Amino acid sequence: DRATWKSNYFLKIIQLLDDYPKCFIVGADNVGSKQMQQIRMSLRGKAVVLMGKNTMMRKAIRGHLENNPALEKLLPHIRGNVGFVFTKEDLTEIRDMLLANKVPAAARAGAIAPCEVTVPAQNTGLGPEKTSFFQALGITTKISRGTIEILSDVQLIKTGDKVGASEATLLNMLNISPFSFGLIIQQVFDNGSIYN
């Protein structure tokens, strides 16, 4: 149950700080479970990435602090959906591989827009029967080669818009999603030191 789940999460955060004295305190903001599972399955032999409740991790640090007096600089940097990644291989190779394991995820109907979605003017490969999903956007189209010809471009959503339902299914039809959310790491903890 929940009590033994709390109590053995305590032990599996005692041990993973005892054996790894080098960490990135990583902000896992709005990434998918799919993407985090495929990154975690890719990076198993190199590192261990871990998540949890911030008010449980900080009390685990305040259960260590009479034994390991170096861990308390983590405490002001644990807020937001922010976990840990532990590694012993090198210092910036895993920074670079976290920057290289980024995947552009789909645009959910209700997510806010980080950056700049447009569509190129092109003949798609969809077909004639799927033009009502363009007519809801009111994009002027033509049909040629049996598929739909986009005449001119449209910047459909700005930097900082709400992604609507009619505007979300059409990008999933065109298999284009510029929204790339990955690990956006904040600080570094290496043996009582802080790097940006």
Binding site: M41, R44, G125, G127, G146, T147
Partner: protein, 153 residues
Amino acid sequence: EIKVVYLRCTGGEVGATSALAPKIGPLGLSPKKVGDDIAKATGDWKGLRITVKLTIQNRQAQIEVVPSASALIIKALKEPPRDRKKQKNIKHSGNITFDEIVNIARQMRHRSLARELSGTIKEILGTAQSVGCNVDGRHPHDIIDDINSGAVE
């Protein structure tokens, strides 16, 4: 311009219900020479439920079978197939053993959507009670295999 499509076919028999044409038609290629060649390319599957990817160029598609774990365990659970009659409840009984479960778990790590082999044998022994047979006992008997009496790589 190389394209990838998926089709969920039924194995060895030529499918009279055409579902190939509504995908192969809009790019122009002939679907009825694709669908029967898929059936003879499967051949020994012959009774089961099989998904197949098709890498289709501007010229010709290539046929190769996507594996699916509930089909791969039931093709090893070999009983004589029921014909056109298709009566009551083909509930699967019989005793598959662990070594072919290992070499099917090899196919489950072929495309690497799992953890390693000690986890794949657990998640594919779960598919055994998804199907309905037993390895001389059920997963309440076969959790204590991977607990301290494993036969795993």
